Amino acid sequence: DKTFPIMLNGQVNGYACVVGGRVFKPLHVEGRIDNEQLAAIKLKKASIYDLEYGDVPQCMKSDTLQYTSDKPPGFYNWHHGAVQYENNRFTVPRGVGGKGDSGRPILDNKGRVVAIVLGGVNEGSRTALSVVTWNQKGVTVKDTPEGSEPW
Amino acid sequence: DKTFPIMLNGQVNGYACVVGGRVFKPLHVEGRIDNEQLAAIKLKKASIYDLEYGDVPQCMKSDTLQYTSDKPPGFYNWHHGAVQYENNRFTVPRGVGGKGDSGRPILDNKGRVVAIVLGGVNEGSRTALSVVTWNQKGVTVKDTPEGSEPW
């Protein structure tokens, strides 16, 4: 599949992912990727975004999730169901997601990644996700609600 | 509606409204709020708008009414009936509302709060409402017809 579980003690710690030309994975998740063709490509870390980036093999190249910085408020999909984008925040119904959900992509309706999750807080009947977005100019920026935790 | 009757001696004196993660309560209406969990947060007052603020506890922050500053003239629902926005004035058909009705939200058709009213003054067959509106730039502002009295 087009996102890979990094593994620790057998028990997937974080799904890392392949976005737009670079595998990305969160720094806090510590694990072997579970795809040999990535499991050794040196990672260039950047703690300001809590992520690690690396070029995918030139053969792997044409599988790589598209992205785009234009994300109007509305419904976006996600492995564990729908996420909703309102008031410049991504929110998920309560209780779905946690330790293990770090770094999975959030895709739009045309299938392109708009965000990669790094954490959460359950807030009442919903959950705000701390995420890495491509801001209105396409610059990456880490958007985090207060008190959010590393998933 | 998520409003709450503030009481003192067991009878309601006004209604307290949560919007955008913040209990809003008209400053003038006095007493004890009907939900203990709100009863503890220290209200931070603002006389310029006759409101007492308080940021709602964490566990309910996603179950808070929205708001908007975008207000076409027209019919806007409201607890006690339909409210008319004409000529940058909030109006209600005559005689409905009074002491206790202060601080109930005024919603638009989409369910969003457009105003929270603090009083009213009779003009013929209607009554113009003294209210808190978020002006065309979104800055909060108290709009009040002349000689309106505190409900």
Added chain:
Amino acid sequence: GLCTCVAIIMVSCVTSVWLLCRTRNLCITPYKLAPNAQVPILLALLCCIKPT
């Protein structure tokens, strides 16, 4: 005096040039990580990049 002059100049120079490199990669890392943001010309000139 000369050994402390060589020491204080070198230490200051290398700490400064490491700060300059750290800010350059902290400027650049967002645009690097977002493959298409239409390249600036005051950021992109100042910090080094092959433009679009």
Added chain:
Amino acid sequence: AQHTESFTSAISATAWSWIKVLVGGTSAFIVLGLIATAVVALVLFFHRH
């Protein structure tokens, strides 16, 4: 003494400048506050109207 003191004969340039900087400091701080109050009133009036 062949002269008369005048209650200002001892102040001297340094103490003059110090008391000036003090009085002017207090005046400037208070006037800055009052101009701030006026600016807030005006911006709020422009906010509604």
